[PDB]
Design a protein around this ligand. Structure first.
Ligand SMILES: [Mg+2]
Ligand SMILES: [Mg+2]
Ligand SMILES: [Zn+2]
Lengths: 135, 94, 109, 71, 38
RNA sequence: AGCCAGGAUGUUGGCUUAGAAGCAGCCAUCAUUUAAAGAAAGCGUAAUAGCUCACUGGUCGAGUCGGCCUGCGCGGAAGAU
């Protein structure tokens, strides 16, 4: 459901996911959920994890999403021959490098943040871990 | 308060640095002021267990190297991304 | 939980009362209900009795102020003490009540 | 044999229903002139020899109704 | 029992026992907790 | 960690309570006695009740508890001569 409201272009090349991540220090809240694996996340996965976190703290607290997709995935339909043009877009993804902080939370106890993030970690295709506020 | 025992990097570069990290040491460097900077290899688990204390980022830190005792303060740190460990520290002279 | 300063603190709270004691009761309390406790607490200050239930191994630190080591080695089993601070008697009598009134323990001291 | 404390706030406090809003909105305020007399008359089945013992004990029960202590 | 790939202690009286190289979960209170192929 | 023992009062905490007494539940979650008793962790209850635990004393006497970095393992794992 998280989706760019307008884009410069329709499509994008496939590209690669080589290297490590930037958004590494916990910079907004008290607790953070960080990627360990390497891959890509859909908007459905991001929204479902957000719903899991907001379920666990029920409403209260403030939650940051440090990621946003801004990359489409083109998908040729069922039973279309190869070639004849690049396919249409059906879902948007975010590029994930390891060490990327994904989610961030402030205003709750540590054990509650810890269990909320382990609820949302099963919603995700990769291994994720728990980080605190640092310097 | 804090006193850090340390050796001297005789080789520098990423090959020696990654050998040194895999040998459960890690490098750092002291700079700032009038002297030419000083590069240090030092033990990992010691300072990794030090730095969780909040006083580590506030107080003045003494370091033993060559017998010489140097008073510094911590400035910035290259933390590793996903494991809970460290790579490199920038220390500032007093 | 229980600080070492807390364990020091209970000793320092009880030892000056032991210094300001006349006689005391070292009993057995193997099973006493809350409603069997609260009226006895009432009768405590109501006759001027200062009663405590301590860590029973932790008494000789405060008791070691001789002349109060008198019946020292009576820590076996759960015990409790009741000091009297005015007119000795009228505190031990309060348990000489219950020794035949609650159909239970013979008091050890 | 002693009357409950939940029903005594319908004859000496001012409210006639219950709370509604325990810590979202205050309805009224309770001073110490209303409860010391009742605590004095209720010295038949209480816990505590000092009057100070049940003083804050009877006051602290009524606090979860959106009432303001006045002392 | 129930044979799920991931087993959990479910109450106070649940218990983890390895038997024949297979993980089993036994409860003394509730018979629903009984699990295998952990 | 076992074992002996306790583990209350106000108190059915207010309530849309059909009926809620920690007892699905919305709110805060505070006071006596002490060594402690969560105005409550969870099975039961027509609603109660009755049996545990978080806590405290004694008996016994040397280690004990689950977090991290890791090498190697286990389950997950069912096809057709
Ligand atoms: Mg190279
Ligand atoms: Mg096999
Ligand atoms: Zn069980």
């Amino acid at each position: 459901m998280l989706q760019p409201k307008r884009t410069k272009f329709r499509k994008m090349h496939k590209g690669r996911n080589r290297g490590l991540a930037q958004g590494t220090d916990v910079s907004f809240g008290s607790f953070g959920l960080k990627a360990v694996g390497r891959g890509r996340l859909t908007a459905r996965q991001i929204e479902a994890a957000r719903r899991a976190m907001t379920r666990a703290v029920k409403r209260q607290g403030k939650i940051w999403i440090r990621v946003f997709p801004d990359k489409p995935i083109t998908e040729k339909p069922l039973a279309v021959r190869m070639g004849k043009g690049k396919g249409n877009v059906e879902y948007w993804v975010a590029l994930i490098q390891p060490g990327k902080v994904l989610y961030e939370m402030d205003g709750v106890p540590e054990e509650l943040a810890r269990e909320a993030f382990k609820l949302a970690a099963a919603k995700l295709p990769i291994k994720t871990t728990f980080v605190t506020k640092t310097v | 308060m804090f006193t850090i025992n340390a050796e001297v990097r005789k080789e520098q570069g990423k090959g020696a640095s990654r050998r040194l990290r895999a040998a459960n040491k890690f490098p750092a460097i002291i700079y700032g002021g009038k002297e030419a900077p000083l590069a240090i290899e030092l033990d990992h688990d010691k300072v990794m267990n030090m730095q969780a204390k909040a006083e580590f980022y506030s107080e003045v830190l003494t370091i033993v190297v060559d017998g010489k005792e140097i008073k510094v303060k911590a400035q910035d740190v290259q933390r590793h991304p996903y494991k809970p460990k460290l790579q490199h520290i920038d220390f500032v002279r007093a | 939980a229980l600080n070492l300063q807390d364990k020091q603190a209970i000793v320092a709270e009880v030892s000056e009362v032991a210094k300001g004691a006349l006689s005391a009761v070292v009993a057995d309390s193997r099973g006493v209900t809350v409603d069997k406790m609260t009226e006895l607490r009432k009768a405590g200050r109501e006759a001027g009795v200062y009663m405590r239930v301590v860590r029973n191994t932790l008494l000789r630190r405060a008791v070691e102020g001789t002349p109060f080591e008198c019946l020292k080695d009576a820590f076996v089993g759960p015990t409790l003490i009741a000091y009297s601070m005015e007119h000795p008697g009228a505190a031990a009598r309060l348990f000489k009540e219950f020794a035949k009134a609650n159909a239970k323990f013979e008091v050890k001291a | 044999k002693t009357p409950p404390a939940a029903v005594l706030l319908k004859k000496a406090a001012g409210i006639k229903s219950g709370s509604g809003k325990p810590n979202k909105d205050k309805v009224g305020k309770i001073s110490r002139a209303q409860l010391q007399e009742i605590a004095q008359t209720k010295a038949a089945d209480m816990t505590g020899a000092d009057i100070e013992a049940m003083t804050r004990s009877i006051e602290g029960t009524a606090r979860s109704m959106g009432l303001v202590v006045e002392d | 029992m129930k044979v799920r790939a991931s087993v959990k202690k479910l109450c106070r009286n649940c218990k983890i026992v390895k038997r024949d190289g297979v993980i089993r979960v036994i409860c003394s209170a509730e018979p629903k907790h009984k699990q295998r192929q952990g």
